[PDB]
Write a protein that binds this ligand. Structure first.
Ligand SMILES: [K+]
Ligand SMILES: [K+]
Ligand SMILES: [Mg+2]
Ligand SMILES: [Mg+2]
Ligand SMILES: [Mg+2]
Ligand SMILES: [Mg+2]
Ligand SMILES: [Mg+2]
Ligand SMILES: [Mg+2]
Ligand SMILES: [Mg+2]
Ligand SMILES: [Mg+2]
Lengths: 642, 655
C-alpha cells in the first residue's frame, strides 16, 4: 500500500517547492498564458468529452473514463507547472541582480514534479479502479473489437495524455515558434514557456506514460499467447500470477523511479549551490540514474523473485537508462557551443548566411547517427536480456528519471525568459544557451524513448489480432509482421510520407500563423489537420487495407519520425546557441551587427520552427498513431476492404 | 536475333545525332572536363580492376568479367554523352543568336542515346556470353562456389554487372556532383559553368543508367529464381513446380522488354527534334516523353503476349492473369512514373505553385525563403510517394514479385527521352551562363533545373520499385542447399518484429542521414579543376566505403536479419530524402531565376528579394545536385552488395 501512496507525496512536494520559491511590472507573461490557455482549454473541452464518448461507445467505457482521467490529469499537471514556470521566471531577473539561478531551476522543477505526481495519481487510479487484471482472458466487447479488459483501459488512459499533449505542442509549439519568428522580425517571451515548458513537458509525459502502458498491455498478454495446446486443451503455459506480477512490476518500477528523481530535485535546489548550471543538471541526472539502477534492482528481485530471471527487466531498465543518458550527452554535444557542432557553424557565420544553413543541416544530419546508434546498440541489449517486455521496461529506463529530465528542460525557457527580460545580460544569456541545450537533451530522451516504446507498442499491435479465433497457434506464428509482403512496404512508404507531410504542414503552420488570441485561436481552429492526419491515418489506411498495411504505415512513421525529431532538435538546437555564441562575440572583430551575426540570426530563426515545432511533433505522432492503430486494428484486421 | 542487334542500332544513332549537330573562344569547358575526367578515370582505373579481381576471387569470375563489362560500358557511355553535351552547349549560344534550342536538346540527346546503346550492348553480351554460352540460364540450379557463397549462376553474373555500373555511376556523382555544386557555390561567391555538365549531365546520366540496369538485373535474378523456390517436396522428391522453360522466358522477357523499350524512345527523340521547331521546350520534352510511353505501352503489350504467351505456372510466379501480366506491370510503373515526373515539374517550376510562392516570399526576408523551401519540398515528397504507394500495389497485384521489377522498368522503360530531357538542362543552362538574349538563355536555364528534377524523380521512384525486387531477391538468396524444400512463403519472410530487423532499419536510416551530412560537408570544404577534382576523388572513398562495406560490416557482424533491416531503413530514408532535396533544389533555383526575371514589381534582381532567392538557390544546390541523387545511388548499391555478401553472412554472422 505504501507504494500506492508514494505518487501522492511527489505532489504535495510540487506544491511545496514553488511556494518556498514564489515567495522570492513584468507580470505581463501570465496574462499571455491565460489567454492561450483559455482558448485552448475550450477546444480541448469540446474535444476531450467527445473522444471520451467515442471510446465509450466503441470500445469499453472503462477505457473512456480512464481516458478522461488522463485528460484531467495531464491538463492539470501542465497547468501547475505553468504557474510555476511563469513565477520563477519573473523571480529570476531578481535572482539575477543580487547575484552581481535557484529561481530558474526551481520553477522548472515545479512542472516536472507535478508531472510525476499527477501522471502517477491518475495511473494508480486506473490500476486500482480498472477485475481486468483478474479477468484478462480475452473479452470480445459489445461490438466486435474483442478488447483487453485492462490493456484497453490503460491504453485509453495513455491515449488521453498523448492527445492533449500533442494538441498543447502542435498549437503551443506553433504559437511559440511562430512567436520567436515574429519577434526577431515581444510575442516571443511568452512563446518560450508555451513552447519549451508546457509543450515539451507534454511530449515527455506522453512518451513516459506510453512506455509504461505498453509494459502493461504486454503483460496483460503473455496470457492468450503462450497458452499450451497439447492435444486440444487450453493450458495456460504462463500462469496468471506470473503475468500479474509482470503487469504490476512496471507500475511498481515507475513508482520506485520518480522517487529517486524527487530526491535529485529536492537535493539540487536546497543542495549547497554551484556557480555553473550545466554541470548541475547533468550531475543530478546522472545521480538519479545510479540511484535508480540499484534500488530498481532490489524492487525487481523481490517483486518478481519467483514467477516461473527475476532481475532481468532491471537489466532492461539499465540498458535503456545508459542508452538514454548517452543520448542526452549526444544532445548536449550537438547543441552547445563549447564543443563542436555550434562552434564550427558559428565561426562559419563569418562566411555568408549560406554556410550557416548548409552546415547546420550537415550538423544535424550527422548528429542524428549517434543517438540512433545508441538506440540500435541500446535496443539489442535492452532486448537480449528479457522478452519484448524487457524492451518496454527499457523505454522506461531511458525515461526512468523523467522528473529531472523535465526539470532541466523547463529550466531552459525559464532561464531563457530570464534572459530576454533584463534587456546582467551575460548571466541571462547563459541561462538562455542552456535553455536551448537542455530543451534539446529533453527532446533527445523523449525521441529515444519514443523508439524504445514504439517497439513494445507495435509488438502489442500484431499481438492484438490474437482474436478468439486464434487462442491456439504458437506465439511465433502470431508475432510475425512480414516485411516482404507488399502491404507492409506500401504501408511503410505511406507512413513515412505521412511523416514528411505532417512536418511540412507543421512548418507551414508555423509561418502562416506567425506572420495572443489571433494566433492562439488560429492555431487551434487551424489545428485539426495534424491531429486528423496523426490519428485517422491508422483508421483510414487500416480500414482501407488491413493489418498488414497499418503495420507498415506505423513502421515508416516510426523510422522517419525517429530520424527527423533528431535532425530538427539537434540542428535547430545548434543554431540558437551558434547565434548566442556570435552574439557573445567570440570571433574577434565581430559582435552583433556585421555579416556573421546576421547569419547566425538566420540560423536561429531557421532552427526555431524545426526544433520547437516539427521534430517534437514527430515525437508525438509516432506514438499516438501507433496507439490508435493498436486499438482500431481490433476492427480493421477483419474489416479491411480490399 | 533481330532483337539482339537492336541495341547496336541505337549507338550508330548516338554517333549520328551529334554529328548532324556538331557541324553546327568558348571551348574553355572542354578543357575543364578532360582534367576532372583524367584524374577521375585514374582513380576509377585503380579501383575497377581491383573490385574485379575481388569479385573474381570471392564469387565467380564470370561475374567479375561481366562487372568489367559494366565498368567499360558505363564509363564509355558517359564519356560520349559528355563530348556531345559539351558541343551542343557551345553551339547553343550560336543557335541562340540567329533565333533573335535544337542544339541544347540534340546535345543532351547524345548522352541518352549513348547510354541506351552501351548499357544494352553490354547486357546483351552478359546474356549471351554468360547466360547462354556458359549455361547459367541453363544450369540455373544452385551452384555452390569455390568458397561457400552458393551463388546463382546467372543472377550472380548480372548482379556483378549491375554493381559495376552502379559503383562507377556513384563515383561520377559523389565527386562530380560534388565538384559541380561545390563549384556553383564558388561561382555565386567561372568554375560553375563546367560544373553544370559534370553535375547534371554525366552524374544524373550515370544515376539513371544505374537505376535502369539495376531494375533489369533484378527482373533477371528473380526469374533465375522461381525454380529453387517453387520446387515441391511431395513425399520427398524435388519436382520443379516451375519448369525451366517458364523461368527462362520470364528471365529473357525483361531483356526483350527493354529492347522493345529503348526502341520506342529513339523514335521520340528523332520525332520531336525534327518536326519543324516549336517555340516552348517544356511542352516538347513532356510530350516526347508522353509519346514514348503510349508507344511503349502498346508494342510492349504485343511483345509480352507472344514472347510469354504460353508459359504455365505464371500464376505461381505471381502472374494473376497470364502472359500479358508483366505488361500490366510495365504499364502501372509507367503511368506511376509519368505522374511522378509531373509531380516533379509541378514542384520545381516557377509557373505553378511551389516555386511561385517561394519566390514571392523572397520579398519577406531570406529566412522565409529558406523555411518555405523546406516546407515546399518536404510536403512535395508525398505525391511522388503516394503515386509509388498506390503504384507498387497495382504493379504488384497484376503479377508476382517479378511484375514489380518489370514495373520499375516501366517507370524507366522510357529512359532515353528521360535522359535526353535531363541532359538538356545543364546544356541549355550553360547556354545560359555563356552569352552573359539572357531571357532566351534563362528559359533554357529554368528548364535545366526542372528537367534535372523530373529526371531525379523518375530515378528515385524506380529506385524504390526496383528496391522491392532486389530486396525480395535478398531474402530469397539465402535459399542455401540446406533449404531447397520449404514453401516460398517460409523463405520470403523478413520479419519486422525481430529486434535485429528494427535495429537494422534504424541503422540504415542513420547511415543514410550520415551519408548525406558527409556529402554536404564535402561540398562546402571542397568548394571553398584539379584542386577540387583530386580532392573530390582522394576524398571520395568515405561515401563508397559507407555505402558498400555497411552491408558487409553490419552483415558480418549481425547476420541476415540485421542487414535486411539496414537495407530497409536505408531504402525508406533515401526515398524520402532524394525527393526532399530534388524538389527543393528544384524550387529554389527557379525561384531565384524567377525573381531575377523580376516578376514582383519594384524588384529587379536587387535587394533582399533577389538576395534571398540567391540564398535559396545556393542552399538548394548542395542538396539537390549532390545529396538526394547520392541517396538514389546508395539505396541500390547497398542492396546489391548485401544481396551478394549475405551469401556469406547469413551463415557466418558473429553473435
Ligand atoms: K531548443
Ligand atoms: K536541379
Ligand atoms: Mg530569438
Ligand atoms: Mg527562446
Ligand atoms: Mg529572447
Ligand atoms: Mg530560438
Ligand atoms: Mg549557379
Ligand atoms: Mg551556371
Ligand atoms: Mg547550373
Ligand atoms: Mg544551381
Amino acid at each position: 500500500a505504501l507504494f500506492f501512496l508514494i505518487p501522492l507525496v511527489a505532489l504535495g512536494f510540487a506544491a511545496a517547492n514553488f511556494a518556498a520559491v514564489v515567495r522570492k511590472i513584468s507580470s505581463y507573461i501570465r496574462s499571455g498564458a491565460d489567454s492561450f490557455l483559455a482558448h485552448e482549454t475550450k477546444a480541448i473541452f469540446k474535444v476531450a468529452i467527445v473522444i471520451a464518448i467515442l471510446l465509450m461507445i466503441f470500445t469499453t467505457w472503462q477505457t473512456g473514463v480512464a481516458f478522461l482521467l488522463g485528460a484531467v490529469m495531464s491538463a492539470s499537471a501542465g497547468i501547475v507547472g505553468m504557474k510555476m514556470a511563469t513565477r520563477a521566471n519573473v523571480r529570476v531577473a531578481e535572482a539575477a541582480r543580487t547575484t552581481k539561478l535557484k529561481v530558474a531551476y526551481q520553477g522548472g522543477s515545479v512542472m516536472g514534479l507535478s508531472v510525476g505526481g499527477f501522471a502517477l495519481l491518475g495511473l494508480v487510479l486506473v490500476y486500482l479502479i480498472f477485475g481486468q487484471v483478474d479477468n484478462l482472458n480475452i473479452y470480445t466487447n459489445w461490438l466486435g473489437i474483442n478488447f483487453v479488459p485492462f490493456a484497453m483501459t490503460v491504453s485509453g488512459y495513455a491515449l488521453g495524455c498523448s492527445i492533449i499533449a500533442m494538441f498543447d505542442r502542435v498549437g503551443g509549439g506553433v504559437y511559440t515558434k511562430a512567436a520567436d519568428m515574429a519577434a526577431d522580425l515581444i510575442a516571443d517571451n511568452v512563446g518560450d514557456n508555451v513552447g519549451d515548458v508546457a509543450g515539451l513537458g507534454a511530449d515527455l509525459l506522453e512518451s513516459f506514460v506510453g512506455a509504461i502502458v505498453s509494459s502493461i498491455i504486454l503483460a496483460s498478454y503473455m496470457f492468450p499467447i503462450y497458452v499450451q495446446k497439447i492435444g486440444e486443451n487450453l493450458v495456460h503455459q504462463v500462469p496468471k500470477e506470473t503475468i500479474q506480477a509482470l503487469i504490476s512490476y512496471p507500475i511498481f518500477f515507475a513508482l520506485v523511479g520518480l522517487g529517486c528523481s524527487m530526491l535529485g530535485i529536492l537535493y539540487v535546489i536546497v543542495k549547497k549551490p554551484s556557480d555553473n548550471p550545466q554541470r548541475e543538471l547533468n550531475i543530478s541526472l546522472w545521480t538519479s540514474a545510479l540511484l535508480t539502477v540499484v534500488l530498481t534492482a532490489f524492487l525487481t528481485y523481490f517483486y518478481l523473485k519467483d514467477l516461473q530471471g527475476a532481475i532481468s527487466p532491471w537489466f532492461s531498465a539499465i540498458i535503456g537508462i545508459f542508452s538514454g543518458i548517452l543520448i542526452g550527452f549526444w544532445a548536449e554535444y550537438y547543441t552547445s557551443y563549447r564543443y563542436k557542432p555550434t562552434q564550427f557553424l558559428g565561426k562559419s557565420s563569418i562566411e555568408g548566411t549560406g554556410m550557416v544553413i548548409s552546415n547546420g543541416l550537415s550538423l544535424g544530419m550527422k548528429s542524428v547517427f549517434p543517438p540512433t546508434l545508441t538506440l540500435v546498440l541500446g535496443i539489442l541489449f535492452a532486448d537480449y536480456f528479457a522478452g519484448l517486455y524487457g524492451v518496454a521496461i527499457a523505454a522506461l529506463g531511458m525515461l526512468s528519471f523523467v522528473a529531472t529530465s523535465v526539470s532541466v528542460d523547463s529550466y531552459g525557457p525559464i532561464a531563457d525568459n530570464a534572459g530576454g527580460i533584463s534587456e546582467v545580460r551575460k548571466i541571462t544569456d547563459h541561462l538562455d544557451a542552456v535553455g536551448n541545450t537542455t530543451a534539446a537533451i529533453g527532446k533527445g530522451f523523449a525521441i529515444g524513448s519514443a523508439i524504445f516504446a514504439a517497439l513494445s507498442l507495435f509488438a502489442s499491435y500484431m499481438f492484438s489480432q490474437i482474436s478468439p479465433s486464434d487462442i491456439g497457434k504458437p506465439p511465433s506464428l502470431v508475432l510475425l509482421l512480414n516485411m516482404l509482403d507488399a502491404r507492409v512496404i506500401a504501408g511503410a512508404l505511406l507512413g513515412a510520407a505521412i511523416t514528411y507531410y505532417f512536418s511540412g504542414y507543421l512548418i507551414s503552420a508555423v509561418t502562416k500563423a506567425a506572420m495572443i488570441e489571433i494566433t492562439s485561436d488560429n492555431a487551434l481552429k487551424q489545428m485539426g489537420y495534424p491531429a486528423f492526419i496523426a490519428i485517422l491515418t491508422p483508421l483510414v489506411t487500416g480500414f482501407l487495407l488491413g493489418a498488414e498495411f497499418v503495420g507498415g504505415v506505423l513502421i515508416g512513421t516510426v523510422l522517419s519520425g525517429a530520424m527527423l525529431a533528431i535532425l530538427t532538435a539537434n540542428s535547430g538546437g545548434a543554431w540558437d546557441n551558434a547565434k548566442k555564441y556570435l552574439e557573445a562575440g567570440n570571433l574577434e572583430g565581430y559582435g552583433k551587427g556585421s555579416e556573421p551575426h546576421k547569419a547566425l540570426v538566420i540560423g536561429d530563426t531557421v532552427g526555431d520552427p524545426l526544433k520547437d515545432t516539427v521534430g517534437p511533433s514527430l515525437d508525438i505522432l509516432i506514438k499516438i498513431m501507433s496507439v490508435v492503430s493498436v486499438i482500431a486494428v481490433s476492427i480493421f484486421k477483419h474489416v479491411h476492404l480490399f
